[PDB]
Amino acid sequence: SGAIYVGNYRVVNRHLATHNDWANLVWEDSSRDLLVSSTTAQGCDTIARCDCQTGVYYCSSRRKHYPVSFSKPSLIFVEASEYYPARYQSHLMLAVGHSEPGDCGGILRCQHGVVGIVSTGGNGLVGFADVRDLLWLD
């Protein structure tokens, strides 16, 4: 679990959005596993506007932050799960690092701010949904 709170927006993994997120929907994209909902209070986060490929992410299954080198946002095949059919997920960045089901929503940050959130993983990999191209969040 986890979310980004910026301005009057809450960014979450689309597959973990709540009834409240859908009732206050701003934008969603199943191909990116992202959903943004509106909030009444001002958020705590700021968004990176950069091309960093190194950063640090929070891994809830280890209660720890890990440094990572991650690929540029791209279209990557993601196998079927209880949440989605087998498909290509766009704007996804992969890295070698631990992750397991439950780690989605953990934030990835570089020196400039929030880069994205954990969205996929497996066998020593962790995938992050990029949010740096969503300029309207600011």
Ligand X SMILES: CCCSc1cccc(OC)c1NC(=O)N1CCC[C@H](C(N)=O)C1
Rg of the chain, C-alpha, whole Å: 14
Cα–Cα dist 80/48, whole Å: 31
Task: Identify whether the C-beta of residue 29 lies closer than 8 Å to the C-beta of residue 39.
Answer: no
Token code pair at residue 18: 């709540």
Examine residue 130 and tell whether it contacts ligand X (CB under 6 A): no
**From 21, 91, 104, 130, the catalytic residue:** 104
Cα–Cα dist 5/3, whole Å: 6
Examine residue 73 and tell whether it contacts ligand X (CB under 6 A): no
Q: Any binding-site annotation on 44?
A: no
To the query of whether residue 91 is one of the catalytic residues in this protein, the response is: no
Judged by CB under 6 A, the stretch of 3-11, 38-46, 64-72, 101-109 that binds ligand X is 101-109
Helix (H) or strand (E) holding 127: strand 125-130
State the residues that interact with Zn ion by CB under 5 A.
Answer: 48, 50, 52, 110, 112
Annotated binding residues for Zn(2+):
50, 52, 110, 112
Annotated binding residues:
50, 52, 110, 112
Active site residues: 15, 33, 104
